[PDB]
Design a protein around this ligand. Structure first.
Ligand SMILES: COCc1cccc(CC(=O)Nc2ccc(-c3cn[nH]c3)cc2)c1
Ligand SMILES: COCc1cccc(CC(=O)Nc2ccc(-c3cn[nH]c3)cc2)c1
Ligand SMILES: [Cl-]
Ligand SMILES: [Cl-]
Ligand SMILES: [Cl-]
Lengths: 373, 379
């Protein structure tokens, strides 16, 4: 009966716990945002609670991390549920990438739970090959994720600017293998591994970001189901082929043509006559681009790491991150975004949730999102 | 960095409204208030409850609950609940536990009187104030675990004994020191009556804090300025407690309250007309200094003995004696030292022996909201 106090204290300090300090503050913050509407304050219990917690909730919001703590330098990404900005912390002056997710768009589209895996993977992967999330926070309108800035840009940009030789493809594939292993070890399946998720740091080394499938990268077991770690390894094979050949293995003008080439992979997968790809590179691509039942990746990464395609003189698995990367970005400053398409800031007022007549709990799906490193 | 440390301080500070216990209360209250079939038709509510189901059940089990105590006897009962003598199942230590009905507090629109009672007992850290070790709750009640005061109250003592002036001097002086300790914390007792004066195992006084009319409880002890204060007629200071001391000293020495009347209106009017209603019976065996002290307290606050501070009260001739000094008063032998048969002895308390619940809500009502932040753990 004395041990209960210690057990509780552990739950409050564990960053992975659903009742840690940040989650409990999120619940109070969410409760105040969801009750503080004129029609709800006609209920005496609600009106009195808000008056009693007014000073402390205002003080908590000011101490806790908020959007105001960061200055927006540029917008480097934009999507249906929000955008990714290059920001500078006002106090420390450190530059970061900050993703914003619109709570209004997520509630409006009954799609308010995809971000949990993204958050957890980047917060807890603790890997040289996974983009790190330093802070997650929120207000009544947005979720925020402060990640390390990757100034090299993505593999989509790299593949369009360069003809990738095998030495480079070996390096990028090996870093993707380690990145996927770190995510799979945590019990997660990335589900949309594609060059868009592969980002390069100031040294030109690859890290996976996790977000959102795409036709060219979709495995046969998905097209015949409308899964395991194998669906991720199919995507690595598509990626290796696209790097070495310049085109995706199952490209077609239409969506249907690509789907049929994917299903008919045993006959559609061909290497061009005008290509001098090694035997071991073709063997690795074919070991991934095969049926789920015999695919490279089912048994784990050790099998992939032992593959002969990765045998080289430059590096070993333990010194891969220590080698000079093939494309090292030349950066003018800590806010250089030359490896990204600069987008414009959208400053216009955005639509918010309908003003409740009774308690609806729009903040409830987001309790527990806050995270401090 | 300093914001991070400031936040961490607020989460651990027992006086903070956002400490771990208060934040767990919010989550607990939210789950109790949302978990109804008509509310779970809302996807946000239904999903939140399913996501927090396991953790809330685990939290409720780890946290202090009524099940941790065995009920030995009921030693007090009121409009909003009861006070039980309990034994902690694990440590087997005996305590006094007050229960406050959430249903009755919501029903009588009286769900905020317990905050000062909780804070005074939890943070006084004084030999003069009853200590609150734990404060906890469930969907039906508030629980206040206090140190047991086996000597009973001054209401009981005054009925069992004819109080000589030597005893009256001792009890009045202990009440003066207990009130000074409460005033030093920034509080006004406002409920100084013999019901609030409890005696420990040595027979020394500690104040508990509670009311026993609709808003003021028993009016016999209420000062003219606090009676006026109801219905926006001015305000009152800490000097309202000194009036109550004058009433108590009079009741001890005379046997009746100075402004007694059959009706509440009669009492209210005698209090306001104190300059003419305050009389001592013809059979006056009370000293000149005892009457002078009573009259110095039972006057208008502008000229009352409490004004200027406690030093003025302490220097009054009624307290001049050979038995004790102000600094050693709690070290002297009390007039009535209780003879206790066991740790369960309730001989100094009177013998005491349909629990209505909240209706099922159609929409969120928030019946648990007035009680978020009540939980308190001493260690
Ligand atoms: C679908 O709706 C959500 C949404 C809104 C915007 C964009 C996206 C896609 C997206 O997450 N890209 C992204 C993520 C991380 C970084 C980065 C990290 N460190 N340096 C750079 C760069 C880009 C999704
Ligand atoms: C009317 O609403 C408030 C209310 C509800 C129930 C009861 C009461 C009266 C009440 O608090 N008496 C009381 C208080 C403390 C102790 C005690 C402490 N340590 N040992 C003993 C004993 C008795 C008030
Ligand atoms: Cl209106
Ligand atoms: Cl690392
Ligand atoms: Cl390096």
């Amino acid at each position: 009966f004395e041990t209960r106090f210690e057990k509780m204290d552990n739950l409050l300090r564990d960053p992975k716990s659903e009742v840690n300090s940040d989650c409990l503050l999120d619940g109070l913050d969410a409760l105040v945002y969801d009750l503080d509407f004129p029609a709800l304050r006609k209920n005496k219990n609600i009106d009195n609670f808000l008056s009693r917690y007014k000073d402390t909730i205002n003080k908590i919001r000011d101490l806790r991390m908020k959007a105001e703590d960061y200055e927006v330098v540029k917008v480097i990404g934009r999507g249906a549920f929000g955008e990714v900005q290059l920001v500078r912390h006002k106090s420390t002056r450190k530059v970061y990438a900050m993703k914003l997710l619109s709570k209004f768009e997520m509630i409006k589209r009954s799609d308010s739970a995809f971000f949990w895996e993204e958050r957890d993977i980047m917060a807890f992967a603790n890997s040289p090959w996974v983009v790190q999330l330093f802070y997650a926070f929120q207000d009544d309108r947005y979720l925020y994720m402060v990640m390390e800035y990757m100034p090299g840009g993505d593999l989509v940009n790299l593949m369009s600017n360069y003809d990738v030789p095998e030495k480079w493809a070996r390096f990028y594939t090996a870093e993707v293998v380690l990145a996927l292993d770190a995510i799979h070890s945590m019990g997660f399946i990335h589900r949309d591994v594609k060059p868009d998720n592969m980002l390069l740091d100031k040294s030109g080394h690859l890290k996976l970001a996790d977000f959102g499938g795409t036709p060219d990268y979709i495995s046969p077991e998905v097209l015949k189901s409308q899964y395991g770690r194998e669906c991720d390894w199919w995507s690595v094979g598509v990626f290796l082929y696209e790097m070495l050949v310049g085109d995706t293995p199952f490209y077609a003008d239409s969506l249907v043509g690509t789907y049929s080439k994917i299903m008919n992979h045993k006959n559609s997968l061909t290497f061009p006559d005008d290509n001098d790809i090694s035997k071991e590179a073709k063997n690795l691509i074919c070991a991934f681009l095969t049926d789920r039942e015999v695919r490279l990746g089912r048994n784990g990464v050790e099998e992939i790491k032992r593959h002969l395609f990765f045998k080289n003189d430059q590096w070993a698995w333990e010194t891969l991150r220590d080698t000079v990367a093939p494309v090292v970005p030349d950066l003018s400053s800590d806010i250089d975004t030359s490896n990204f398409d600069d987008l414009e800031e959208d400053k216009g007022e955005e639509e918010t949730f309908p003003i409740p007549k009774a308690f609806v709990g729009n903040q409830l799906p987001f309790v527990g999102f806050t995270y401090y490193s």
